[PDB]
Write a protein that binds this ligand. Structure first.
Ligand SMILES: *C(=O)/C=C/c1ccc(O)cc1
Length: 124
């Protein structure tokens, strides 16, 4: 159905969803493993960044796809959350690698499932 960016139970709703439903979301959604490998990447995220979802699946988000996120403010918070088991943070960021610099809001949250973490993205 509809689900709003930043919803308190977003991870419960998205646990229900297959690839096609994820492509129906109003915001960008990326699912990562604990090493930052890309497990899912939806159509809305591709609309923001110009990346073909089919070609980024399996690549490492912090090393290869999104080097500008390798920073204490983004990757640093991700690794702290993976280690502590409590990842749930929202912040503003700029995506500027091989693209027009684009201001975004990012929400990172642990999934329901084992060894999975979401990055949600919306333009601001
Ligand atoms: C900075 O390098 C960010 C790059 C980026 C962010 C999000 C994406 O889905 C793809 C590339």
């Amino acid at each position: 159905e509809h689900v709003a960016f930043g919803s308190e139970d977003i991870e419960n709703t998205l646990a229900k969803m297959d690839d096609g439903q994820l492509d129906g979301l109003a915001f960008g959604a990326i699912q990562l493993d604990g090493d930052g490998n890309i497990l899912q990447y939806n159509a809305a995220e591709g609309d923001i960044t110009g990346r073909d979802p089919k070609q980024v699946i399996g690549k490492n988000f912090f090393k290869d796809v999104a080097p500008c996120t390798d920073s204490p403010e983004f990757y640093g918070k991700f690794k702290e959350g993976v280690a502590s088991g409590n990842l749930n943070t929202m912040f503003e960021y700029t995506f500027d690698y091989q693209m027009t610099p684009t201001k975004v809001k990012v929400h990172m949250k642990k999934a329901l499932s084992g060894d999975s973490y979401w990055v949600f993205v919306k333009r601001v």
